[PDB]
Design a protein around this ligand. Structure first.
Ligand code: SG8
Ligand code: SG8
Lengths: 447, 447
């Protein structure tokens, strides 16, 4: 009764749209057994390398677990817990005959619109594992971006430790995936794909991937991206202003030597004007210690008021540098040394950026870019599945009488997604690739 | 060609499932013109009273807008901005001929699976207005629960003002509804209901309401409910312990008078044992000032160490109260006055709960309970729409040859939902129903 790619089945749930007794064969008709075997090689490679190196990093954190429950380590721990669980789920298709168990129905058709009764749990389990670890992973990524952003604002005793926020971090990171997963199962939109060897949301009805895949991931790129940009906004404000205020102090010092060793009134004059231009450039800046303060505060007032006195004292020294009162101008500029000390020296204070915090910023922008690729690949599949579906409907009709599949999913896009998803797990596992861990695995080698 | 409830239409998008040339009539076939007219009376009543009283509260906040952008007022302002915009959307069906424009198609069938081309914007606009204000409203509700929870932890100089968090509050409250709304429009699941007179997500395909209605609202009840419970956990910890530590000081004082005015050694003995039991009961408590501290800190140590000295001094006074050394026991218990002063008097410190913060807790638990009803009503419709749908399919088949609609949506449940949704807007608008606003509308009456 049925012709390729349809298959004989007496289950009304397995039957194809309009057609009776026939349902779509389990092995993805849009891809050849060679394309499948190749894809399964890609998944096993990236999955295996992610799985054990995330396990290594997860083992490193559990070794030093007293010192690992200390921010931002505890974040990278959970980020790893998620990519490790996601790798397990993806690596389930490799167990002897497990892929057919996950992606196929009893009657040999594709496992679609799961959960269903009379069909097994193997599909929904691998979906929950992969999807729940994914959404928990991208929400732990948001936590990471927040922590990294929080490192800059807490540059003093404005200190509200992340140690207390831990209760809200574990609220969001486990309630959000739970609610989204429960919703997917309630509407039974877990579907199997043999090239993926995994069960996932809205494979078949691509419209369920908007709300459950593109909308959560889209949101984490918004909230995550906000905290990554606001942080580098502070990193570059601090690093540039300290460098600006330093270079203005240095030219001020340079000219004070040019004045001290001046053999004429013309040199003192141009050296004081250069000092005045450097004093205004320094006034038109925020000292790193006054970054978390308002651009009109009584503290920020003292900074810019000191440069008013310095410009004022420069202007008094310029009233003597125009004529032959060089000795009276150099002695005036010598009292400029004491003003520069009482109103600039204080603002050359380092405000040294912690190595752990700067490193967290490296990981945040790497986890971002990877999730950005995931979102792009998933988005691509969303906007083109209607086409792949109608090009498939035609293949079954053509073969219900030279038959081809005109449009089809891109396998480089699927491999680019899996790279940018597994590569993240490998990237976030390189957080423990430090000297301290080499010694952590040496202090446990004996003990 | 078509029989009731189907209607003649040549648009393939308007046609019913399997049937050609026939599509389902716009006026909701499951409800009578009387049931409709009644429902439109309910919506106009609750909508009109919410709409103008939210507008009043929105006008009160914009009057004192300098002092209104101060937490938690700024929250209630946006909560109101949302119920006011949602009321506008709900009240659009009352404009002369607008309901048919919103809920009907050109051909007279129900407006379903919108956005579509060749059909008008009237549907999707009213959906965005109602849905975006809803999701923004329940996320502003979460912000409210967080603010109220934050009032208790910041009981000193641990002060991290909400004034700084405002940037993250406006991140979440406008990015989350935007992403969810964009997703609904991308999968075209805006549907019209004539009894509602509004366009909304997944009216027809009830499965799209899980992810876009039950999952966001479900989440806000989780995150919102967490901050409401953790706050009352602190309100009741503080109010009970201060009362516990007060009542233990009072019985200690009571017995010190019973000792001072004792005419025998037997009275001094039972009065000191009662003082010792009250001293341990007081030791087995957390002073409100030491609530945000760890139950083993060097400060919490001093508290419980003072009661060790007091019990120690009571035990020394009990060594004299057993025999006829009454005068030597009363004088020993008189030096107990000084110990009680140096180790208990400090912990009777008020730690007075701000009236604004306690009031915010009243509104948080009211907005919660209302959203809890909304979630229950929406959940009810989700689990029963498959039934109402199959009972409808039968009505069209029966009428394609005594015909009735066996199962149908509950109109008290729809009226209970609309009450618990409009009533919230009216409840959250009663935040400005204070003396200060009566004077705010008096200081603007002239000026
Ligand atoms: C997120 N990354 C994705 C990208 C796209 C991938 N994907 C989606 C999918 C999987 C399983 C079943 C159906 C499906 C569709 C329509 N009716 C029944 C089943 C659709 C596919 O490769 C396939 S299989 C397949 C099919 F059998 C019929 C029609 C299709 F158009 C089609 C497509 Cl598209 C999987 C991996
Ligand atoms: C959240 N609060 C809700 C509760 C339920 C409400 N609701 C859902 C709805 C609205 C509009 C179209 C369809 C719809 C369904 C199936 N095919 C085509 C259209 C379904 C209904 O009252 C109706 S109308 C209606 C119908 F015309 C056909 C079959 C139905 F079963 C049914 C139901 Cl159920 C609206 C308000």
């Amino acid at each position: 009764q049925c012709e390729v790619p349809l298959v004989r089945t007496d289950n009304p749930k397995s039957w194809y749209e309009d057609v009776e007794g026939c349902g779509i064969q389990c092995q993805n008709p849009l891809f050849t057994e060679a394309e499948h075997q190749d894809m399964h090689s890609y998944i096993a490679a990236f999955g295996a390398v992610t799985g054990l190196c995330t396990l290594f990093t997860l083992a490193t954190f559990v070794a030093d677990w007293r010192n690992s429950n200390r921010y931002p380590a505890v974040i990278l721990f959970y980020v790893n817990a998620c990519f490790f669980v996601g790798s397990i789920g993806w690596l389930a298709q490799f167990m002897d005959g497990a892929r057919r168990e996950i992606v196929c129905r009893a009657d040999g058709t594709m496992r679609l619109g799961e959960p269903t009764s009379n069909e097994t749990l193997s599909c929904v389990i691998i979906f929950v594992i992969v999807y729940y670890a994914l959404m928990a992973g991208v929400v732990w990524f948001v936590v990471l971006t927040y922590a990294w952003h929080t490192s800059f604002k807490a540059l003093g005793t404005t200190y509200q430790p992340l140690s207390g926020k831990t209760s809200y971090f574990h609220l969001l990171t486990w309630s959000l995936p739970f609610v989204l997963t429960v919703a997917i199962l309630a509407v039974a939109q877990v579907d199997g794909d043999s090239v993926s060897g995994i069960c996932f949301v809205g494979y078949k009805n691509y419209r369920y991937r908007a709300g459950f895949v593109l909308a959560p991931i889209g949101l984490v790129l918004i909230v995550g991206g906000y905290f990554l940009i606001r942080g580098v906004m502070t990193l570059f404000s601090i690093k540039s202003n300290h460098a600006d205020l330093e270079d203005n102090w240095e030219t001020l010092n340079d000219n004070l030597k040019v004045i001290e060793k001046a053999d004429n009134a013309a040199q003192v004059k141009d050296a004081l004007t250069k000092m005045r231009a450097a004093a205004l450039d320094a006034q038109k800046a925020t000292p790193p210690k006054l970054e978390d303060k308002s651009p009109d505060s009584p503290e920020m007032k003292d900074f810019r008021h000191g440069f008013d006195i310095l410009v004022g004292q420069i202007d008094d020294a310029l009233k003597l540098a125009n004529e032959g009162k060089v000795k009276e101008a150099q002695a005036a500029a010598e009292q400029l040394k004491t003003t520069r000390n009482a109103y600039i020296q204080k603002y050359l204070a380092a405000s040294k950026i912690n190595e752990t915090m700067l490193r967290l910023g490296i990981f945040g922008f790497l986890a971002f870019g990877f999730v950005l690729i995931t979102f792009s690949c998933h988005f691509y599949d969303f906007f083109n599945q209607a086409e792949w579906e109608r090009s498939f409907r035609d293949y079954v009709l053509c073969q219900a009488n030279d038959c081809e599949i005109k449009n089809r999913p891109s396998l480089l896009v699927e491999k680019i997604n899996l790279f940018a998803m597994f590569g993240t797990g490998i990237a976030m596992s390189t957080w423990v690739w430090t000297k301290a861990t080499l010694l952590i695995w040496r202090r446990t080698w004996c003990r």
